[PDB]
Amino acid sequence: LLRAIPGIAWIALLLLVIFYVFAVMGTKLFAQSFPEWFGTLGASMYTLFQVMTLESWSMGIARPVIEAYPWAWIYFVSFILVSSFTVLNLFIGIIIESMQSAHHAEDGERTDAYRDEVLARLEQIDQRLN
Amino acid sequence: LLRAIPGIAWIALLLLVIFYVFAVMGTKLFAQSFPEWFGTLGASMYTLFQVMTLESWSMGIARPVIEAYPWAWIYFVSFILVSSFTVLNLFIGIIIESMQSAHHAEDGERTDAYRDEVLARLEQID
Amino acid sequence: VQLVESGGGLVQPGGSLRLSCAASGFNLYSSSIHWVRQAPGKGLEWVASISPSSGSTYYADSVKGRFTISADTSKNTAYLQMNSLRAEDTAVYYCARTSRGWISYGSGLDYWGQGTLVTVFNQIKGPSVFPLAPSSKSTSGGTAALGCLVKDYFPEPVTVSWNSGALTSGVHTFPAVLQSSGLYSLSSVVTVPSSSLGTQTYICNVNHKPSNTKVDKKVEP
Amino acid sequence: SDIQMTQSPSSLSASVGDRVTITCRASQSVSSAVAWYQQKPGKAPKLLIYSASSLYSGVPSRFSGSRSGTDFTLTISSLQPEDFATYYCQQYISYHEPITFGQGTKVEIKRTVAAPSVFIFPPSDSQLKSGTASVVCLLNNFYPREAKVQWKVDNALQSGNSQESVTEQDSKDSTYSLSSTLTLSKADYEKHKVYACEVTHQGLSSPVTKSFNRG
DSSP, X not given: OTXXXXXXXXXXXXXXXXXXXXXXXXXXXXXXXXXXXXXXXXXXXXXXXXXXXTOOSHHHHHHHHHXXXXXXXXXXXXXXXXXXXXXXXXXXXXXXXXXXXXXXXXXXXXXXXXXXXXXXXXHHTTSSOO | OTTHHHHHHHHHXXXXXXXXXXXXXXXXXXXXXXXXXXXXXXXXXXXXXXXXTTOOSHHHHHHXXXXXXXXXXXXXXXXXXXXXXXXXXXXXXXXXXXXXHHHOOHHHHHHHHHHHHXXXXXXXXX | OEEEEEOOEEEOTTOOOOEEEEEESSOTTTSOOEEEEEOTTOOOOEEEEOOTTTOOOEEOGGGBTTBOXXXXXXXXXXXXXXXXXXXXXXXXXXXXXXXXXXXXXXSSOSOOOOOXXXXXXXXXXXXXXXXXXXXXXXXXXXXXXXXXXXXXXXXXXXXXXXXXXXXXXXXXXOOOEEETTTEEEEEEEEEEEHHHHTTSOOEEEEEXXXXXXXXXXXXXX | OOOOOEXXXXXXEEOTTSOEEEEEEOSSOOOSOEEEEOOOTTOOOOEEEETTTEEOTTOOTTEEEEEETTEEEEEESSOOSOOSEEEEEEEOOSSSSXXXXXXXXXXXEOOOOOXXXXXXXXXXXXXXXXXXXXXXXEEEEESSSOOEEEEEETTEEOSSSEEEEEOOOOTTTOOEEEEEEEEEEHHHHHHOOOEEEEEEOTTOSSOXXXXXXXX
């Protein structure tokens, strides 16, 4: 539970600075054509918020990328590519730490058992003789 | 199976940004002499593509590095160095996760055993 | 809240009128105002949009550069100079805020501006007094109708009255039809008894303030 | 980008209390941020539906808008006193290149199928004196709007020498007036004697035609 807690924090930080990168990436070379929302790195948060809000308003910018930077198909695929690669693993990573706990515990539960049945079998003999 | 899946993704990302580095590395100090294909970081993809295509055309540039940037022996050894360091480990890493499964399973297989022989040695005493 | 809509009027081509829009009961400085024209018998046409906190030079292709819209935050005041009219842009224009600021909708039209009618084409007209009375065989024992006609009108509007407006029932003022020459044209008539024709006097009163032309003409067989 | 909010239908005549749906078709991927508004004649815009679901503070519940990707549709089930209305969409970017509002949907109140009262208006000598001549055929208190204007000069039909105009439904009779003026050169006025017009409408079970001879 608390073990995996730190794991996501560093990953989200990777993701945070993955943002800082893609913000530094996007802003510079996507502005001057449609520079209302591509001046500041803030636009990447917007871009997040955009994606959170299922933008389809960069569809506009995508029409503008078809007019201005068709490469942006990549630099839209990029935001999509970067997000999934990030968010899944941070989740999977935790799925794993979630799935990793119980298997030990299952064996942990079975751990105490075999010895008990043995610790049982041992004193079980001590009556038919003593 | 699905555990190791993420492993390669982060490694390839290391490799991706290892590219971004070696691209930032190559481009800056390999251009102005032969700057047709060393202006943009794109040239590193080209460089990949080059290596994928068994370049031996940077042999030219290597003759030009012997003329212009003999350091490029490093900055060729670099692309080679970075690639192997990356690709092997992503593979080894998986070899390991492959080899890690059975070694544990072997004990898993032996796990069911000792209890059986016990579960046997328990009803045996009656 | 209140939207200040002024600076309308009639003009000739090549002319440049500045359509003013002043902020009342809303901080425009954070808000954003858009302009959209309603041609007679046609819907809206999203002209432009703008301080929009950031200085959004936003205007439709229809008047792309031909018009330039802006605003003075310091006075809580905005403007729209539709130059280069063409007469194509001759339509009643109303400016309003679909603002993405703090005070207006953000989703759409927060409110509607009073709107000022701009007529961009120049002559002087409405000289026609054409009475349309029924034939000698007007429906006897039934209802018969008669009225004047005002042809070669330019521009709209045309103020009409029947017996100096004294009779309202039956009166119907035809819509303005723009004739080939470039003059609007319509008419008006009203139903009345045939017995009321030869007895009661009926004279349609007409007024056109632009040409300031006054006309009242009677009706009879 | 580009947007073309194709609103339907063209003429929408209906009875009060009935349920009516105003549909509009999106060209490209128009999002949830759809707007529709309705205004009386010579009256200010009234934003009807915000974010394609949100009624503006004070907007009655009587009407509602639905979204189906490309298809965006508004609907009202109970005729409010504002029965006679118009309907046009509005397609937005949060802040981007494309701006568009709807091509408009005329929302008419369908009344009784009334026999349209018809009369003739021949040109006056006084009118003709100037060298311009016009014959008008009267069509007042009409229902429905669908009617056929057909003029015959000396029993011979003409083309291009007429302008057609149509009033709104009466304040009392709920019946509309239609203005049709046949107009040609003074020479033509003298060149023909028999002046007649054929009016075609549902109210005209037997279509009626009135005539006049020159002089």
